[PDB]
Amino acid sequence: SPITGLVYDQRMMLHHNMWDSHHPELPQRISRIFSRHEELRLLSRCHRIPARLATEEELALCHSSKHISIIKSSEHMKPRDLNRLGDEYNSIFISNESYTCALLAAGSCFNSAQAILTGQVRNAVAIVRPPGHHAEKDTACGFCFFNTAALTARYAQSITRESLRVLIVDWDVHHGNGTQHIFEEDDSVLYISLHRYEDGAFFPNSEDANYDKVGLGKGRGYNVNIPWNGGKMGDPEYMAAFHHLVMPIAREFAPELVLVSAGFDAARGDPLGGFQVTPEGYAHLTHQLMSLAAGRVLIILEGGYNLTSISESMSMCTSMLLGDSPPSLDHLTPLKTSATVSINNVLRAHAPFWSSLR
Numbered sequence: 001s002p003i004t005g006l007v008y009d010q011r012m013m014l015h016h017n018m019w020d021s022h023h024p025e026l027p028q029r030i031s032r033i034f035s036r037h038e039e040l041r042l043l044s045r046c047h048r049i050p051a052r053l054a055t056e057e058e059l060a061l062c063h064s065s066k067h068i069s070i071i072k073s074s075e076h077m078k079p080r081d082l083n084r085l086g087d088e089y090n091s092i093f094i095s096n097e098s099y100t101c102a103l104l105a106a107g108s109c110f111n112s113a114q115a116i117l118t119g120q121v122r123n124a125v126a127i128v129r130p131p132g133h134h135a136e137k138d139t140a141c142g143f144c145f146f147n148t149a150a151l152t153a154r155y156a157q158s159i160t161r162e163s164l165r166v167l168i169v170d171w172d173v174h175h176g177n178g179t180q181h182i183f184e185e186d187d188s189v190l191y192i193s194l195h196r197y198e199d200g201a202f203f204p205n206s207e208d209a210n211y212d213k214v215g216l217g218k219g220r221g222y223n224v225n226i227p228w229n230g231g232k233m234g235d236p237e238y239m240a241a242f243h244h245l246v247m248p249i250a251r252e253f254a255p256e257l258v259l260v261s262a263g264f265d266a267a268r269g270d271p272l273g274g275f276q277v278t279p280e281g282y283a284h285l286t287h288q289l290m291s292l293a294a295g296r297v298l299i300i301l302e303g304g305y306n307l308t309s310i311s312e313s314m315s316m317c318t319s320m321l322l323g324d325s326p327p328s329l330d331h332l333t334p335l336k337t338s339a340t341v342s343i344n345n346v347l348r349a350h351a352p353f354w355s356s357l358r
């Protein structure tokens, strides 16, 4: 009798790269995930939540009006202008439909958050593109135009109270620089990220992503960065990180709503991440988060670029939200030595702020 929501809309496939049809952020990323849900017959077990466009008023919850106006103008640009405008950012391609698709993925998530916080569904999954977590207040970055998960947290605050406590768990393989920045001075939104770092060398190449960035002002303590260095990470490393850091801090935060920036480019077989998290692994992480916030969980697709890997992985995540038993997880071998060093580094950076860490 608890209902799981699912939002997907084909029109988000229209955002595309007109000079390199093989660019890895592919229209069929969302259609492959959705099709895999039909094959496992999870689709008919969920309630369909419709997509909509975000308003420009809603976009102003996190983004400047200058940044909204430039992306918006690209809907009518000639190809040569689309290319020149795209090159003014760090890793961005743009077509005439890009604007609408970025509006569609945020509006799909506002509707999903609204269904949760009125008690129409218990939890929800959002099969959307282009992704959001690199987008800054003032600019686009790394295939992202608007920060969908940040906009979703402010929209949720706007339909409840302003200080509603939102936990954002970001398990995409890259650091969510735009999201950290948007809430760095905020104690109402808890940002927890796992990400490949390599002493600042992995994308997005900034030392903002190290464990010593714990937040500013009244937000000191509410930013948790868990960086990996020098190892091909997998299910052991992520199970230990939840067990020691994510779940203690998050229980102590006691969120009223949980957003997952759910990128699957740390999954075994991705051509960018170099990690080996399994679909079983992602399922267990989902299952653990389900214990927070009276189960109010929203799963947001971010990165992830092996088509088979992202389909199997998110589908396991939907199977957890629907209530199925967690799958057989293999053996938690000891952690790569460097992954232990990483976890201890976060415990020492955050134990002054969280009484459940030492």
Ligand SMILES: CN(C)Cc1ccc(S(=O)(=O)n2ccc(/C=C/C(=O)NO)c2)cc1
Pocket: 091, 131, 142, 143, 172, 173, 174, 203, 205, 263, 265, 272, 302, 303, 304
């Ligand atoms: C090594 N120096 C030159 C910097 C550098 C520049 C570009 C690229 S890139 O073009 O390969 N690139 C862009 C975005 C993503 C990931 C997106 C995602 O999944 N977020 O979740 C991957 C990598 C590195």
Ligand SMILES: [K+]
Pocket: 170, 171, 172, 173, 174, 175, 176, 193, 194, 195
């Ligand atoms: K991340």
Ligand SMILES: [K+]
Pocket: 183, 184, 185, 186, 187, 189, 190, 191, 215, 219, 222, 223
């Ligand atoms: K924060």
Ligand SMILES: [Zn+2]
Pocket: 172, 173, 174, 263, 265, 302, 303, 304
């Ligand atoms: Zn990524």
